[PDB]
Every structure is written in C-alpha cells, then in structure tokens.
Amino acid sequence: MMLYIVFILSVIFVMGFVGFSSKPSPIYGGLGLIVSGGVGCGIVLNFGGSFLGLMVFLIYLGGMMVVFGYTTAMATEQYPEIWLSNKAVLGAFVTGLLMEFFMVYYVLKDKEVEVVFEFNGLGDWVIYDTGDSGFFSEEAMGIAALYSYGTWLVIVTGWSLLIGVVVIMEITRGN
C-alpha cells in the first residue's frame, strides 16, 4: 500500500547501506550509497522537506562522482570484488539483509519491536500534523533564516570551508 511508502523507502535505505557496508569494490559501494541517497531524499521529501531531500541527493551525487574518480586511481585492483566474489563480503551482505528481514517481519506482524528503543508499527502516517501552514513552506522559511538568524553559523561554516581549502593543499603538498 502507498500508505507505507515511507517505510518501503526506508527498507531500501537500509539495503543500500548493507550494499556499501559489506565493503565490495568502492565502485559498487559508491552505487549503494547513491541508492541510499536517492531513497533518503524520498523519505525526507515525504515529511515536508523538498529542499532538504533534493539537496542531500545533489550533494551526494557530486560526492560519489569524485569518489568514483579516486577509486579508479587509488582503490582499484585487477578483479574488483562484488557482493558474491568474496565470502567475507557475501557473509556480511547476507547477514545484513537477514537482520533487515527479521526487523521488518516482526514490526509488521506485532506492530511493535523493542531494540534499545521501543518502535511502533502502526505506520508513519499516524504522527503527521493535521493543520495546514499558510502561504509558505515552513522548511524553506527555516532554511532562509540562516542569513538573518544564523549570523554565527555562517561565519564558522564560512571559515571552515576556507580553512578546508588551505588544509587540503597543505596535506597533499608532499614537500
């Protein structure tokens, strides 16, 4: 049912994580993180944040494109490993999906599960707000306050990105 779209996207979100957490060739690990970024954008986008969902997808699409170039230069071998070529990779991949299956199986059967925290399986739609906003997007108004309210945040992040460029040149200088 489409009422569980958020839950169905979060299952793919975990499956993508098991994709790169099992650590095959970073080429295939990068693909797994793109799938998680794509569905993660979908999950966030269904809670009312379209800018946040599209932005994280946009940032991670460029992030894994640099990682792809770095994988062909410094993280490549003759036979890049897939989720089936190695027992250690395959073992961790099957284990991740089985735990995902059991958690999904129990939450949809009992409507509850207790692991550190107590989770509810009624559906994500039961916690949404029943009132409408006005003529604006609340997420957009909060993000636009960074420049009027977040003067201190803009300075530290701005300085951090500046020093970030200085640092990477220093680290990679080699002399």
Ligand X SMILES: CCCCCCCCCCCCCCCCCC(=O)OC[C@H](COP(=O)(O)OCCN)OC(=O)CCCCCCCCCCCCCCCCC
Site residues for ligand X per CB under 6 A:
87-88, 91, 95
Nearer Cβ to ligand X (87/173): 87
d(CA 161, CA 149): 20
Query: 18: which DSSP letter?
Result: H
CB of 72 to other proteins, least distance (A): 11
Q: Is 131 left (phi over 0), alpha (psi -120 to 50) or beta?
A: beta
37 binds, among ligand X, other proteins, none (CB under 5 to 8 A by kind): other proteins
47 binds, among other proteins, ligand X, none (CB under 5 to 8 A by kind): other proteins
Nearer Cβ to other proteins (1/131): 131
- C-alpha of 54 from chain center: 12
Residue nearest to ligand X (CB): 91
Nearer Cβ to other proteins (2/118): 118
CB of 85 to ligand X, least distance (A): 11
What is the DSSP secondary-structure string of 118-153? EEE-S-GGGGS--S---SS-HHHHHHGGGTTT-HHH
105 binds, among ligand X, other proteins, none (CB under 5 to 8 A by kind): none
Q: Using CB atoms within 10 A of its CB, is residue 15 exposed (0-12), middle (13-18) or buried (19+)?
A: middle
Q: Using CB atoms within 10 A of its CB, is residue 34 exposed (0-12), middle (13-18) or buried (19+)?
A: buried
Nearer Cβ to ligand X (91/158): 91
Nearer Cβ to ligand X (60/93): 93
Nearest of 74, 36, 31, 27 to residue 57 by alpha carbon: 36
112 binds, among ligand X, other proteins, none (CB under 5 to 8 A by kind): other proteins
CB of 173 to other proteins, least distance (A): 7
